[PDB]
């Protein structure tokens, strides 16, 4: 089956846990429960290539900044996440997450992921966003952040609707074998 280790990092509340849980259980958690750390599994095929996918959920809170890197040894592929409806989390990719990730794992493929794709064109979100003189992140914007960090790929998706979810994991694995 070939073990593949995958770690998911990114800002508080960008929807890392939902991504993992919705993909692994096709059920969307309504929770909301801040994460310390957590482990998950999937056995998948890909591309004819049976795999065993270890999934590591990390904490977004900086308080757990000492914990987080404990997950990084042996990692094969990273998912750096930001919410398409939260330019703070997008900026933090270049500020914190990609530097931290590269500090520890200089060589492992990264996969930039824009989350909450379903709120991108949401009336009620663009309203509150634009009340902070802000704007949802756009496909070309995400694409450009990918370039700066030389991520193997940029992918947008919604865990709640599942648009593009399978695809995030199916190129996370392809980035490995």
């Amino acid at each position: 089956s070939q073990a593949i280790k995958c770690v998911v990092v990114g800002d508080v509340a960008v929807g890392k846990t939902c991504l993992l849980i919705s993909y692994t259980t096709n059920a969307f958690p309504g929770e909301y429960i801040p994460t310390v750390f957590d482990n998950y599994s999937a056995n998948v095929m890909v591309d004819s290539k049976p795999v065993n996918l270890g999934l590591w959920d990390t904490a977004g809170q900086e308080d757990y900044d000492r914990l987080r890197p404990l997950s990084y040894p042996q990692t094969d592929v990273f998912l750096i996440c930001f919410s398409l409806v939260s330019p703070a989390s997008y900026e933090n990719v270049r500020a914190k997450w990609f530097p931290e990730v590269r500090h520890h794992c200089p060589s492992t493929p990264i996969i930039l992921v824009g989350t909450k794709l379903d709120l991108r064109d949401d009336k009620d979100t663009i309203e509150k966003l634009k009340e902070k003189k802000l704007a949802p992140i756009t496909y070309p914007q995400g694409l450009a952040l990918a370039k700066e960090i030389d991520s193997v790929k940029y992918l947008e998706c919604s865990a709640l609707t599942q648009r593009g979810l399978k695809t995030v994991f199916d190129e996370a694995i392809r980035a490995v074998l």
């Binding site: 310390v36 750390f37 482990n39 757990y64 000492r66 404990l70």
Partner: protein, 105 residues
């Protein structure tokens, strides 16, 4: 390899108590109580009171703790009772949990 102090939880006395614990092959040993072997007007105290067989257990981490500890994991028997452990610091919970989880998978 994996070794260190853990709190252990007594279902009967409803208290947590400190034990030096360690792992070898796939057996976890816990010592006697450290505070109580140290109050002892005697010296007694065993490093190995007893031994759990990790092969017959699964590790489970409590999402939000248990019994007024924040960082607790549980050895839930596959066959025996649960053994409930706890650390002071989350970085211990992590290390401990993974050792055993790698052993139980």
């Amino acid at each position: 390899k994996q070794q260190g102090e853990l709190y252990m939880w007594d279902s009967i006395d409803q208290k947590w108590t400190r034990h030096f614990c360690a792992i070898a092959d796939a057996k976890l040993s816990f010592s006697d109580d450290i505070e109580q072997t140290m109050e002892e007007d005697n010296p007694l105290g065993s490093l190995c009171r007893g031994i759990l067989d990790l092969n017959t257990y699964n590790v489970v981490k409590a999402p939000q703790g248990k019994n007024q500890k924040s960082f607790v994991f549980i050895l839930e028997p596959k066959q025996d009772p649960p053994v409930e452990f706890a650390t002071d610091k989350v970085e211990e919970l992590f290390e401990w949990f993974q050792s055993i989880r790698e052993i139980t998978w």
